[PDB]
Design a protein around this ligand. Structure first.
Ligand SMILES: O=C(O)c1c[nH]c2ccc(Br)cc12
Lengths: 9, 272
């Protein structure tokens, strides 16, 4: 299952 | 001058937080991180002497009093089109996102230690009048030798207040359902929601929700074996109604949180 970072700012 | 005080090394990363380089303070070889923020991207501004600085600088100064689980701002500079922030750099270090990717779901004893230290760090921020607004594994550094966690990237933060927030630039998949639904939230209860997301992340190996419909739906499916006590704490932090969420005191008094490891024990048992 694809784990990913998520952007902020 | 900035160029003579610090030896600049490789880029560590870049993103919404700006560009961050490894560095060394020339005067004593202290490892530092050198963070560059473009002025044109700074939404919220503050004053110190009334010098107009990014809010991030104001928040870092408010929390950088003493020793804590928060990244320490050592110095800062203004340039024509940017600010430069000097942060203390742990070594060796790994951020908690990469740690969980490589390790998978964390044993509950290790999640308890990590989660406890994050709670203590967030309490420290709130005690200092600072709301981080972007608590997530990516914004937590692990000092692998000391077993200490450090909160980073205050660039989405705000002065803590008791009235409603109607702006938000943190990470959407850690944001609470009242933000998704109404573009309104209060600081402490929204922080507790993101902490519930973080704790699920630690004990299951990834966050529970990716889509708005999951955030607001109010169902927490556990994809890993997780103790009944931990599941209860997670589901309590992820209460749909903000007033149904625990306070920081209730989190730290929860049965799942008792008998936490010391930082050095955590390093010796789980990190070295
Ligand atoms: O590497 C990165 O992306 C970082 C972003 N903010 C930071 C603060 C201190 C340190 Br060390 C590293 C970073």
């Amino acid at each position: 299952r694809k784990r990913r970072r998520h952007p902020s700012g | 001058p900035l160029e003579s005080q610090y030896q600049v090394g490789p880029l560590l990363g870049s993103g919404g937080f700006g560009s961050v380089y490894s560095g060394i303070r020339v005067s004593d070889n202290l490892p530092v991180a050198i963070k560059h923020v473009e002025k044109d991207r700074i939404s919220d501004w503050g004053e110190l002497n009334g010098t107009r600085v990014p809010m991030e600088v104001v928040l870092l100064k408010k929390v950088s009093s003493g020793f804590s689980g928060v990244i320490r701002l050592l110095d800062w500079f203004e340039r024509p089109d940017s600010f430069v922030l000097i942060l203390e750099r742990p070594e060796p270090v790994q951020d908690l996102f990469d740690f969980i990717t490589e390790r998978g779901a964390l044993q509950e004893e290790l999640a308890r230690s990590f989660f406890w230290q994050v709670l203590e760090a967030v309490r420290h921020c709130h005690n200092c009048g600072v709301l981080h607004r972007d608590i997530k594994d990516e914004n937590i550094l692990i000092d692998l030798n000391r077993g200490e966690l450090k909160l980073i990237d205050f660039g989405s933060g705000a002065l803590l207040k008791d009235t409603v927030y109607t702006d938000f630039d943190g990470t959407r998949v850690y944001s609470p359902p009242e933000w998704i639904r109404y573009h309104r939230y209060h600081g402490r209860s929204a922080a507790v929601w993101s902490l519930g997301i973080l704790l699920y992340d630690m004990v299951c190996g990834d966050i529970p929700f990716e889509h708005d419909e999951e955030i607001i739906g109010g169902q927490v499916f556990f994809r890993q074996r997780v103790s009944s006590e931990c599941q209860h704490l997670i589901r309590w932090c992820l209460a749909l109604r903000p007033s149904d969420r625990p306070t920081f005191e209730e989190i730290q008094n929860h049965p799942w949180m008792q008998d936490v490891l010391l930082p050095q024990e955590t390093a010796e048992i789980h990190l070295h």
